[PDB]
mmCIF file with all atom_site columns, C-alpha atoms and ligand atoms in Angstrom:
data_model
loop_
_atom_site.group_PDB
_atom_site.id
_atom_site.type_symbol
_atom_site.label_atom_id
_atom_site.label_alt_id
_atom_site.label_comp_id
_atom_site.label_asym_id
_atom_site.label_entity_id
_atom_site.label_seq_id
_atom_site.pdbx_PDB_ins_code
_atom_site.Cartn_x
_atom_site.Cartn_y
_atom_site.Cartn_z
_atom_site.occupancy
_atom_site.B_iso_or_equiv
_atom_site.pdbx_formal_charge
_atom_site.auth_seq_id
_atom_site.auth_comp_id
_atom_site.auth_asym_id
_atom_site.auth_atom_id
_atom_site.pdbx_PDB_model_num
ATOM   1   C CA  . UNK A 1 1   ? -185.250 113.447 -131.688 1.00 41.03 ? 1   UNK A CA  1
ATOM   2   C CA  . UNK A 1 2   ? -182.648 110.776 -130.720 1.00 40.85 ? 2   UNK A CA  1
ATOM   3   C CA  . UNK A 1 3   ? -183.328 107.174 -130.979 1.00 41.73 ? 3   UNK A CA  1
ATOM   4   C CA  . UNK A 1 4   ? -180.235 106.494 -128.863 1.00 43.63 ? 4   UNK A CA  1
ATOM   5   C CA  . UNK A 1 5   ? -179.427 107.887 -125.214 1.00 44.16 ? 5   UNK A CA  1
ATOM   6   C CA  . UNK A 1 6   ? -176.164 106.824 -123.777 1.00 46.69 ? 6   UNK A CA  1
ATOM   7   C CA  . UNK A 1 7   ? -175.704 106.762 -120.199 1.00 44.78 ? 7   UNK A CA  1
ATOM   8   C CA  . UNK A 1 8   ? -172.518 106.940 -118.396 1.00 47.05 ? 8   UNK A CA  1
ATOM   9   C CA  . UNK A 1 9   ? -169.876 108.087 -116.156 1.00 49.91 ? 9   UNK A CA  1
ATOM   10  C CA  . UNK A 1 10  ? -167.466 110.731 -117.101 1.00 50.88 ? 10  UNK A CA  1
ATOM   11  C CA  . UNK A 1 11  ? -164.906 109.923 -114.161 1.00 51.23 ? 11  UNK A CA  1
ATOM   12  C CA  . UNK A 1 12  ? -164.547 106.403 -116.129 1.00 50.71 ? 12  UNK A CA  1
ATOM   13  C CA  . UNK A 1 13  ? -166.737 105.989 -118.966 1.00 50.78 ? 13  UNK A CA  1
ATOM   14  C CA  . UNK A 1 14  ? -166.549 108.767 -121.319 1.00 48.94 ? 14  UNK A CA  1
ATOM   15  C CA  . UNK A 1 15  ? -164.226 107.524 -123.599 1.00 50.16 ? 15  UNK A CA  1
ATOM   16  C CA  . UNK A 1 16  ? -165.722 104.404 -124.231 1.00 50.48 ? 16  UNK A CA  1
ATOM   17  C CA  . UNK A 1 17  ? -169.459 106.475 -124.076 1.00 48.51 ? 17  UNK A CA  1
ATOM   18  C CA  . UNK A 1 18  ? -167.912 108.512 -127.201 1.00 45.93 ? 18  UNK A CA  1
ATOM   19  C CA  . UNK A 1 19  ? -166.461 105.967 -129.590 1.00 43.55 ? 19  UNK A CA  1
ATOM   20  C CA  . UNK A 1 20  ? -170.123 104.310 -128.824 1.00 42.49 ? 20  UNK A CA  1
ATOM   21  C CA  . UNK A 1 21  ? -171.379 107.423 -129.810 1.00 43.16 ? 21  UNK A CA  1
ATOM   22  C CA  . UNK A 1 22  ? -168.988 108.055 -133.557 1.00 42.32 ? 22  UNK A CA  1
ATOM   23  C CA  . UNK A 1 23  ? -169.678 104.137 -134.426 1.00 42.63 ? 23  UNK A CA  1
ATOM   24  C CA  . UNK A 1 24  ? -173.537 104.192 -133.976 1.00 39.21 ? 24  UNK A CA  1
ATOM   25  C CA  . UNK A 1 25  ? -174.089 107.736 -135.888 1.00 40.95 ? 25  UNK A CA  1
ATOM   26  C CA  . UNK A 1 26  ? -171.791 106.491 -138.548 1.00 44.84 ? 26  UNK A CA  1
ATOM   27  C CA  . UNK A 1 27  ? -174.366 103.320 -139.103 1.00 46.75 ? 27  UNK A CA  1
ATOM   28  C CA  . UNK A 1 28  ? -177.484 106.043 -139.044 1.00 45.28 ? 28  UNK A CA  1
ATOM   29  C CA  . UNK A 1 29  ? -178.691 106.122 -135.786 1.00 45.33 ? 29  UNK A CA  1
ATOM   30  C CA  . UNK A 1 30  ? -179.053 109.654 -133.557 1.00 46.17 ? 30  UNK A CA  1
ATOM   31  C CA  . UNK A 1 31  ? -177.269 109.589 -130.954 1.00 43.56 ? 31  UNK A CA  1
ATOM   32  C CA  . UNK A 1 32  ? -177.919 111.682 -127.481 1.00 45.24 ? 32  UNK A CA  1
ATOM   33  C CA  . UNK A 1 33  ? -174.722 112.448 -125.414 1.00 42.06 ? 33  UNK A CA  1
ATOM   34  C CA  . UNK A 1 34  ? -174.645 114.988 -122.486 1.00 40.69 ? 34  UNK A CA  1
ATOM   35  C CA  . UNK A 1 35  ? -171.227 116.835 -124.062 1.00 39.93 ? 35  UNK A CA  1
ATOM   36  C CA  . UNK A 1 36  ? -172.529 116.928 -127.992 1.00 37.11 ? 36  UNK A CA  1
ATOM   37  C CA  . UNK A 1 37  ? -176.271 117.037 -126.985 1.00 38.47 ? 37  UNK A CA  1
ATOM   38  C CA  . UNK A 1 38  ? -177.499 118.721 -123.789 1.00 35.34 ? 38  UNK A CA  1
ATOM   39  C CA  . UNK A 1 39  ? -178.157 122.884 -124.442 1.00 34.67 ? 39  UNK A CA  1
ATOM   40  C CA  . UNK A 1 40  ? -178.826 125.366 -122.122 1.00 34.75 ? 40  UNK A CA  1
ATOM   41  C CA  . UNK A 1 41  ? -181.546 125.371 -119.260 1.00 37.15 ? 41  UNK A CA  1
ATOM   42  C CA  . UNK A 1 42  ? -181.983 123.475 -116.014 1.00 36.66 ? 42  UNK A CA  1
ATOM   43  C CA  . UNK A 1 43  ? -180.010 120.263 -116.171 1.00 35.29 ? 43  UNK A CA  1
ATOM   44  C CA  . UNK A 1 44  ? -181.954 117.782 -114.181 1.00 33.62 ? 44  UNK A CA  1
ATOM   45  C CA  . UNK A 1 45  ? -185.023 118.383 -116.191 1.00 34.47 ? 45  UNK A CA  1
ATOM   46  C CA  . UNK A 1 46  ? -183.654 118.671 -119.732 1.00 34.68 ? 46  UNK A CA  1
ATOM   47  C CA  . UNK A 1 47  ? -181.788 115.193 -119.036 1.00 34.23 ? 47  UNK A CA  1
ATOM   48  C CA  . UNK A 1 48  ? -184.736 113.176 -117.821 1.00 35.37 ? 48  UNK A CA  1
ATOM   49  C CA  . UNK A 1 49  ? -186.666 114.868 -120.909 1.00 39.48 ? 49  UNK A CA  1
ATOM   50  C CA  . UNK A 1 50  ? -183.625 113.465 -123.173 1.00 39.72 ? 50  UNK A CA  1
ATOM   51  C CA  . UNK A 1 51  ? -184.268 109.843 -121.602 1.00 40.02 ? 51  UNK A CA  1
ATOM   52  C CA  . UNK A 1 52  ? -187.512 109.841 -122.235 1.00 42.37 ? 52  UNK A CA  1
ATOM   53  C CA  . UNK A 1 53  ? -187.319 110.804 -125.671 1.00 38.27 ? 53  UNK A CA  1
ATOM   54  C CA  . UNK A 1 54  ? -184.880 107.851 -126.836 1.00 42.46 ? 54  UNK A CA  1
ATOM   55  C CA  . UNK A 1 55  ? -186.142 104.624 -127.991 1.00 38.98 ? 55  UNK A CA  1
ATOM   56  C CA  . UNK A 1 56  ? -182.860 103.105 -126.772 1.00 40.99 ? 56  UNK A CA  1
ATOM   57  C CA  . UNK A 1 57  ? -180.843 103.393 -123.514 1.00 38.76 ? 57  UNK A CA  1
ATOM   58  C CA  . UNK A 1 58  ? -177.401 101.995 -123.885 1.00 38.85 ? 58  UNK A CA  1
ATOM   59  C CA  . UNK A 1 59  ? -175.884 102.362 -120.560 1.00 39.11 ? 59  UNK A CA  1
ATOM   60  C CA  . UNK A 1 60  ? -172.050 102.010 -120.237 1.00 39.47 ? 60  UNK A CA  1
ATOM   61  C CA  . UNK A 1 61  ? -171.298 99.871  -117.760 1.00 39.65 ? 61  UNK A CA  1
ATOM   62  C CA  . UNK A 1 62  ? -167.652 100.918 -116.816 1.00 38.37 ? 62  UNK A CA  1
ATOM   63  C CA  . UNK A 1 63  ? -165.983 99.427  -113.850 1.00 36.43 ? 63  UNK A CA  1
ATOM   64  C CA  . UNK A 1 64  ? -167.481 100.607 -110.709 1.00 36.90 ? 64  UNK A CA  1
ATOM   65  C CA  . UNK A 1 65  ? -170.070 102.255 -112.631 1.00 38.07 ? 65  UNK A CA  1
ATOM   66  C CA  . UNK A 1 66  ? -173.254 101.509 -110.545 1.00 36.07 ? 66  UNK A CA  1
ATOM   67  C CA  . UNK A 1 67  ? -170.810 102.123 -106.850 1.00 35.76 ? 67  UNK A CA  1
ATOM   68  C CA  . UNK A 1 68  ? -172.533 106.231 -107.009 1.00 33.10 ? 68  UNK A CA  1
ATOM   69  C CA  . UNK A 1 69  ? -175.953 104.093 -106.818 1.00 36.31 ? 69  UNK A CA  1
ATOM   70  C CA  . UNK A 1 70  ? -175.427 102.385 -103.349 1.00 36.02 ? 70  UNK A CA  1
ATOM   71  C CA  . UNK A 1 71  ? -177.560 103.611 -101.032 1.00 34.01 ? 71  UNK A CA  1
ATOM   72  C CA  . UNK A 1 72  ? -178.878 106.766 -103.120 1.00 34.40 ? 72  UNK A CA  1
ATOM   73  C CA  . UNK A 1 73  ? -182.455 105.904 -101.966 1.00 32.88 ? 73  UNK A CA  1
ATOM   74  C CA  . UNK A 1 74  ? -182.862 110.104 -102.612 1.00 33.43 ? 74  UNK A CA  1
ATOM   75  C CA  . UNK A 1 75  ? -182.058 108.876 -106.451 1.00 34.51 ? 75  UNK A CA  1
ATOM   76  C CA  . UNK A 1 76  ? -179.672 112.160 -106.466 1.00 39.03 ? 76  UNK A CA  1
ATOM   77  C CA  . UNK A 1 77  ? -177.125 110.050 -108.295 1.00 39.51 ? 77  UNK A CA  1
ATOM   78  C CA  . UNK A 1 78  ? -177.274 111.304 -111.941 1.00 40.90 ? 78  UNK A CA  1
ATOM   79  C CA  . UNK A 1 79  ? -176.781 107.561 -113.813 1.00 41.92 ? 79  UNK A CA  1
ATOM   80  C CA  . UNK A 1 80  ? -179.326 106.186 -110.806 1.00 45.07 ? 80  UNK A CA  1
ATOM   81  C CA  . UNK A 1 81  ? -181.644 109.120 -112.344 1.00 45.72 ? 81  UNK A CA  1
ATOM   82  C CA  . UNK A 1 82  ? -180.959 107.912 -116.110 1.00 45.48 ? 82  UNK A CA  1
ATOM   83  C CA  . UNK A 1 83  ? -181.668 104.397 -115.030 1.00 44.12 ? 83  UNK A CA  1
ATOM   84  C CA  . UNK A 1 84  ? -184.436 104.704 -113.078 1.00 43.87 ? 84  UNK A CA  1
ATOM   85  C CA  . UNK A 1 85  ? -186.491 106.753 -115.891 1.00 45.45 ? 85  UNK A CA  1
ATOM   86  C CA  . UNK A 1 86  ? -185.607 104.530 -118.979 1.00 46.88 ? 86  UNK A CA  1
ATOM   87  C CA  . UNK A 1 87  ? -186.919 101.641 -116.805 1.00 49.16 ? 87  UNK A CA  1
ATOM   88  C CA  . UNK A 1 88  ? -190.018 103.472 -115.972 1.00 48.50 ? 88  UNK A CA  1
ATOM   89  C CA  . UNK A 1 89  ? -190.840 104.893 -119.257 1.00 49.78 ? 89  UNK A CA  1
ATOM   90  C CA  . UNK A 1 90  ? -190.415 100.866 -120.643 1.00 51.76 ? 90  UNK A CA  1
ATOM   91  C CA  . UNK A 1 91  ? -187.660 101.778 -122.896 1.00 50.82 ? 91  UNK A CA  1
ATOM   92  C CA  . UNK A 1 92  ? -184.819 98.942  -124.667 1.00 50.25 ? 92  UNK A CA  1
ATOM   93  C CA  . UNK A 1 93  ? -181.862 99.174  -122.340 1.00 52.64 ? 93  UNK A CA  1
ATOM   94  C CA  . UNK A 1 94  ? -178.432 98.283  -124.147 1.00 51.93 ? 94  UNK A CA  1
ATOM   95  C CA  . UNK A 1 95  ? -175.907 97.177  -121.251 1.00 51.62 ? 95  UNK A CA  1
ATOM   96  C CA  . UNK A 1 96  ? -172.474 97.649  -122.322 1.00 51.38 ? 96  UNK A CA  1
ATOM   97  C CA  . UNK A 1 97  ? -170.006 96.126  -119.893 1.00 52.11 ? 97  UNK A CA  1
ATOM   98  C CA  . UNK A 1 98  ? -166.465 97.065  -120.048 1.00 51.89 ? 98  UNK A CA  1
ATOM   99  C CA  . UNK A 1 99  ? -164.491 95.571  -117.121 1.00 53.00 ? 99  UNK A CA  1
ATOM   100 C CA  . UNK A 1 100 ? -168.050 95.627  -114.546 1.00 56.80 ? 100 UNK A CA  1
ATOM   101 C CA  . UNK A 1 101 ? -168.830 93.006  -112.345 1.00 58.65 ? 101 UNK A CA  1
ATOM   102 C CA  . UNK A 1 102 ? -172.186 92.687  -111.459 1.00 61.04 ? 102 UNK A CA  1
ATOM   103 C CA  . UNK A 1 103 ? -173.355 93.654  -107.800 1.00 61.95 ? 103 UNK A CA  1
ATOM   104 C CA  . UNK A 1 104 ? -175.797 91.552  -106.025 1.00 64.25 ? 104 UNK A CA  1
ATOM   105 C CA  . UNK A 1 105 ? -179.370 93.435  -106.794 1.00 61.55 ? 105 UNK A CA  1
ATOM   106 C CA  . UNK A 1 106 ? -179.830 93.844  -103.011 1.00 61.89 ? 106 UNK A CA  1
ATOM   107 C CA  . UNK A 1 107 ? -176.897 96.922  -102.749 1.00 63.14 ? 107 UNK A CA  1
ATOM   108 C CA  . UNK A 1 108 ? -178.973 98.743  -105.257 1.00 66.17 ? 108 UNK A CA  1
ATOM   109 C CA  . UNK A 1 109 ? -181.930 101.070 -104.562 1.00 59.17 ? 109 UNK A CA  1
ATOM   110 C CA  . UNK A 1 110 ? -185.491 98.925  -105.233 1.00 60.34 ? 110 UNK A CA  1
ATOM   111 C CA  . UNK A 1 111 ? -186.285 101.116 -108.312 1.00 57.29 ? 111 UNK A CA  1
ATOM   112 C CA  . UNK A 1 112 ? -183.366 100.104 -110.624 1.00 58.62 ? 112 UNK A CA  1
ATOM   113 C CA  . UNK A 1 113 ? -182.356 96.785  -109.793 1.00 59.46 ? 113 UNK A CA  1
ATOM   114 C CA  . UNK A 1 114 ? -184.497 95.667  -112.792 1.00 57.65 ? 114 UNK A CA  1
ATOM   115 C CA  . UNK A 1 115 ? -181.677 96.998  -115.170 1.00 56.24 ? 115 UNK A CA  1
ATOM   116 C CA  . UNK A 1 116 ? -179.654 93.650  -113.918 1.00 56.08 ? 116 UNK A CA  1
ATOM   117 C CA  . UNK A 1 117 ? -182.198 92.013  -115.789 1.00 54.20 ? 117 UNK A CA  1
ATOM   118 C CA  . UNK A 1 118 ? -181.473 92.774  -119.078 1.00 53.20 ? 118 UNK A CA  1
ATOM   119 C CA  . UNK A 1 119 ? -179.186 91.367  -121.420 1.00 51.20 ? 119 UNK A CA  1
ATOM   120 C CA  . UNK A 1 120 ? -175.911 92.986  -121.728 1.00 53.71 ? 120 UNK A CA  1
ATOM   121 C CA  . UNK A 1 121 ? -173.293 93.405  -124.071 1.00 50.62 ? 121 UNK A CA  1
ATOM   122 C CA  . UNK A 1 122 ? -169.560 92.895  -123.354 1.00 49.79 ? 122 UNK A CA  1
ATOM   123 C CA  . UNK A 1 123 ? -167.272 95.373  -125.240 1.00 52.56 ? 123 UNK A CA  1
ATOM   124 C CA  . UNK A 1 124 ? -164.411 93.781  -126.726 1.00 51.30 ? 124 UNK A CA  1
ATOM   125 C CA  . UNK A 1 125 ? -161.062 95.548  -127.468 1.00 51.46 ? 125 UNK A CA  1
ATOM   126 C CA  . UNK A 1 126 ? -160.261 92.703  -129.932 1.00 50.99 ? 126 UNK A CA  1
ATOM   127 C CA  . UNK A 1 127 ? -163.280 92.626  -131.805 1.00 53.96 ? 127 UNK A CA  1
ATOM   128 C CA  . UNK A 1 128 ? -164.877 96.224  -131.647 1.00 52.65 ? 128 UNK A CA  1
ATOM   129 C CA  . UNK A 1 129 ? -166.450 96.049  -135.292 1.00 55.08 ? 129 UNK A CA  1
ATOM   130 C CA  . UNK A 1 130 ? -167.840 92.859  -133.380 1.00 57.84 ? 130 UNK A CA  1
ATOM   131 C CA  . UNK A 1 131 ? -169.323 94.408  -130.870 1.00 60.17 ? 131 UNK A CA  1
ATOM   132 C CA  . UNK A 1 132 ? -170.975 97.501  -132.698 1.00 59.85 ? 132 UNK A CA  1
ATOM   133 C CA  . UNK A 1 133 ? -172.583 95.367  -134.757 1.00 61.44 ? 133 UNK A CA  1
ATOM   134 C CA  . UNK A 1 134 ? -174.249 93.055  -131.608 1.00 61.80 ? 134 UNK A CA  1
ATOM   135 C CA  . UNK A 1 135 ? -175.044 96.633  -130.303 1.00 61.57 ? 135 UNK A CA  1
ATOM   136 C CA  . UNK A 1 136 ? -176.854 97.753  -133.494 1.00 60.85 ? 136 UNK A CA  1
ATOM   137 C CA  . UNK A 1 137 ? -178.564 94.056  -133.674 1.00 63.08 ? 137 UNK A CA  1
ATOM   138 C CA  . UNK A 1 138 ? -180.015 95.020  -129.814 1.00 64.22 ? 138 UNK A CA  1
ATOM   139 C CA  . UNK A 1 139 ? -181.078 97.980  -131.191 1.00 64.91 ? 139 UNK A CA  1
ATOM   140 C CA  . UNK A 1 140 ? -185.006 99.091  -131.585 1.00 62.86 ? 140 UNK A CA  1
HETATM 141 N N1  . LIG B 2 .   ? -174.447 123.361 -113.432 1.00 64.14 ? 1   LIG B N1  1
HETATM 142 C C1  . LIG B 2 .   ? -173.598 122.535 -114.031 1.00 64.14 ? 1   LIG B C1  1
HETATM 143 N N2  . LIG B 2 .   ? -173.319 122.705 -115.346 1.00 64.14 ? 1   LIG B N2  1
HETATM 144 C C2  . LIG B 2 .   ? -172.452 121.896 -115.940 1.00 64.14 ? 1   LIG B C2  1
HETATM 145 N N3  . LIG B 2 .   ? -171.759 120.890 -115.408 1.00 64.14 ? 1   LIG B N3  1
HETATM 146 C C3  . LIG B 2 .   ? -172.053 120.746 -114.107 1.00 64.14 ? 1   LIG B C3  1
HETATM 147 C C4  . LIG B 2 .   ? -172.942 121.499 -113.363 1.00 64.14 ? 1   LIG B C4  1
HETATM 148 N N4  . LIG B 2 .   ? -172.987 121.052 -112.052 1.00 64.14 ? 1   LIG B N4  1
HETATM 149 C C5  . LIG B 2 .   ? -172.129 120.062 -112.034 1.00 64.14 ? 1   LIG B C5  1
HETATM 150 N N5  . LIG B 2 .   ? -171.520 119.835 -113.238 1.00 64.14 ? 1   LIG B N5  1
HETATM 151 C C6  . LIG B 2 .   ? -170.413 118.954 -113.570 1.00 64.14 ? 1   LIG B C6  1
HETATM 152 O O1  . LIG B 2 .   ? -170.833 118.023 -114.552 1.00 64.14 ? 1   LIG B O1  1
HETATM 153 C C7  . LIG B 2 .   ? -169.956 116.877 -114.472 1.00 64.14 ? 1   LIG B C7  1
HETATM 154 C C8  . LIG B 2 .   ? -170.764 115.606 -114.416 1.00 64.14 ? 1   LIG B C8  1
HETATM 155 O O2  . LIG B 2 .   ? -171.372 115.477 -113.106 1.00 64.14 ? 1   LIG B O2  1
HETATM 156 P P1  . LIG B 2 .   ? -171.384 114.099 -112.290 1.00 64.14 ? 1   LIG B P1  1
HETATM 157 O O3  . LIG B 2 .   ? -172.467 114.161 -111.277 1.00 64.14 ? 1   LIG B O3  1
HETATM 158 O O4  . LIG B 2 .   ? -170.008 113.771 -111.871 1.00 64.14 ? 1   LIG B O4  1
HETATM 159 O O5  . LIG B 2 .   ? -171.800 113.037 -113.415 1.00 64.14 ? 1   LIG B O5  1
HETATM 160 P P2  . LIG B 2 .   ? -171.682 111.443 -113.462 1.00 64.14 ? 1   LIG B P2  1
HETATM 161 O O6  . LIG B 2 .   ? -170.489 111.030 -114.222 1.00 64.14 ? 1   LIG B O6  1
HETATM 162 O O7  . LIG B 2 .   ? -171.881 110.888 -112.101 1.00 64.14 ? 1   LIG B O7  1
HETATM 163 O O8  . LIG B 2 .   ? -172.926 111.123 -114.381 1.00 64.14 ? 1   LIG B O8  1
HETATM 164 C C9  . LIG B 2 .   ? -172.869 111.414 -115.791 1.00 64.14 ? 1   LIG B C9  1
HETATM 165 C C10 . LIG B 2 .   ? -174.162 110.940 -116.397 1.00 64.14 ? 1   LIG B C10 1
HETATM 166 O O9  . LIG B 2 .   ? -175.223 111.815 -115.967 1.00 64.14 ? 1   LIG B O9  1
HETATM 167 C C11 . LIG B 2 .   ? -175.440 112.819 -116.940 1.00 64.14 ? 1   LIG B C11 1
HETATM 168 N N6  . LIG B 2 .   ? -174.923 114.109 -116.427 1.00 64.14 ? 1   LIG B N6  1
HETATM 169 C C12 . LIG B 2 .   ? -174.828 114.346 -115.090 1.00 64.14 ? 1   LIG B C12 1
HETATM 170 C C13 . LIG B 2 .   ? -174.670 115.595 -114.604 1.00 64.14 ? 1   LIG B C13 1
HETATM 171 C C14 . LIG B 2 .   ? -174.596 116.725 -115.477 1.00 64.14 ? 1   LIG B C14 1
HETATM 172 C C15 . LIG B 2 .   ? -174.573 118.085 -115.088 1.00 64.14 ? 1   LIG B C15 1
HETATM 173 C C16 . LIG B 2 .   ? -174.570 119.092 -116.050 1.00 64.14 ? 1   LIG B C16 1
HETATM 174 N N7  . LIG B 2 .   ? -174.541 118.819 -117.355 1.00 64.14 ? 1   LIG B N7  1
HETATM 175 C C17 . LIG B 2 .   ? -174.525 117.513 -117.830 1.00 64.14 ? 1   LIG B C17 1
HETATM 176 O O10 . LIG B 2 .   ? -174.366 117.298 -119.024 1.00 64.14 ? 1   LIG B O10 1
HETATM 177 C C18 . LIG B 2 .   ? -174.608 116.459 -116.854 1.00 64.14 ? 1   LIG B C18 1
HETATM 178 C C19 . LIG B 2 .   ? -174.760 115.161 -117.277 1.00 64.14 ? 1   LIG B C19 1
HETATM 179 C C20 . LIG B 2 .   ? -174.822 112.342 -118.256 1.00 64.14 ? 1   LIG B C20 1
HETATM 180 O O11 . LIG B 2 .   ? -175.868 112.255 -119.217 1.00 64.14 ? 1   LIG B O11 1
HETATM 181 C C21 . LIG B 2 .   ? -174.187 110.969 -117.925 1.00 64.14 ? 1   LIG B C21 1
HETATM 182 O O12 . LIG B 2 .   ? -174.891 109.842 -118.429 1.00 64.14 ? 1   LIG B O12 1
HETATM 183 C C22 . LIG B 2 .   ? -169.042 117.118 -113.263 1.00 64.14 ? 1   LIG B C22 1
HETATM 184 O O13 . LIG B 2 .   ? -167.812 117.682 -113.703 1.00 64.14 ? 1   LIG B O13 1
HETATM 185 C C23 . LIG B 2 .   ? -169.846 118.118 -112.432 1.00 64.14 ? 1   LIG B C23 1
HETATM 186 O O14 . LIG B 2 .   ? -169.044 118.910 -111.565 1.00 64.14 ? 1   LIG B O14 1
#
């Protein structure tokens, strides 16, 4: 099974979410992405199950990426879903931040403002072989 899960969103993220993805299998880790990863069945459960399963949960912090979250108290926001179970089931949450500012933890539902808590990683154009190699140091 994976020992990477990378969260993000496709409307701003995916690109970055891939070349993530390429850099960290080419250094040995397996890597969980919806588009190369997720098979057929019901979506919602086979996601949360893919979470769960991944030691790591790098989460790609693209800008505006956590605006879906506000006020999704009903947690029917996909990346509030991803977030909410890798922070239940304990697991080593890899913030990437690519252009995000960080939101005051009161606009965010109760159950994932802990994931402002953890120490992110800031993606750098300039220094990329830089920054995948901070990435793979944060990795368990
Ligand atoms: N029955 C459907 N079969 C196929 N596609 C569908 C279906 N219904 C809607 N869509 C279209 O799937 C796209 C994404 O949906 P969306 O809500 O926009 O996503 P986010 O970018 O907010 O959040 C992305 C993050 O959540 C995870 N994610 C979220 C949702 C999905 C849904 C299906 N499959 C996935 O692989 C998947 C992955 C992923 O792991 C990322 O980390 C849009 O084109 C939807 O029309």
């Amino acid at each position: 099974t994976p020992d990477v899960f990378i969260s993000y969103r496709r409307n701003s993220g995916s690109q970055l979410a891939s070349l993530l993805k390429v850099h960290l299998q080419l250094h040995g880790f397996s890597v969980f992405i919806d588009v190369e990863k997720l098979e057929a069945g019901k979506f919602e459960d086979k996601l949360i199950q893919s979470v769960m399963g991944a030691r790591n949960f790098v989460l790609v912090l693209s800008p505006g990426a956590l605006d879906k979250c506000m006020q999704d108290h009903d947690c029917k926001d996909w990346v509030h879903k991803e977030i909410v179970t890798a922070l239940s089931c304990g697991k080593n949450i890899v913030p990437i931040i690519d252009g995000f500012e960080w939101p005051e933890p009161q606009v965010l539902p109760e159950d994932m403002q802990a994931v402002l808590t953890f120490n992110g990683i800031k993606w750098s154009h300039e220094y990329q072989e830089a920054t995948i190699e901070k990435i793979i140091r944060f990795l368990q």
